[PDB]
Write a protein that binds this DNA or RNA. Sequence first.
RNA 1: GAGGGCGCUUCCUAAGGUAAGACCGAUGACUGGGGUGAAGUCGUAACAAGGUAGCCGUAUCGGAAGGUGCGGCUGGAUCA
Length: 40
Amino acid sequence: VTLRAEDTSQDMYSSIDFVEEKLERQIRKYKTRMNRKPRN
RNA sequence: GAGGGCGCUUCCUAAGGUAAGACCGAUGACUGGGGUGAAGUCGUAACAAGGUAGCCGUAUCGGAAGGUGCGGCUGGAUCA
């Protein structure tokens, strides 16, 4: 898979914070999108 | 002689002490919860049949979201 992340906050430190946490929650979205190649 | 102040004790008796509380405030080592703020860190849950739909009352096991089970209802689905 390929997935980029050009996102924002007010602070660049807060963009590193909330956007890399957004990468964590993206992999949380990518659990069944990765692991569950069976949906049944 | 009567009566009279004083003569003359007591009654109630103001205050002070006692004891055994109760009330109410202040106060307090450490400590339980809650709210606020970071943007640490743990996590996939709750949201779509939101990734095991849940949601209750209840018992019980988790660091924690939570789980297991008793029974009930859609404020639930593909449509059963």
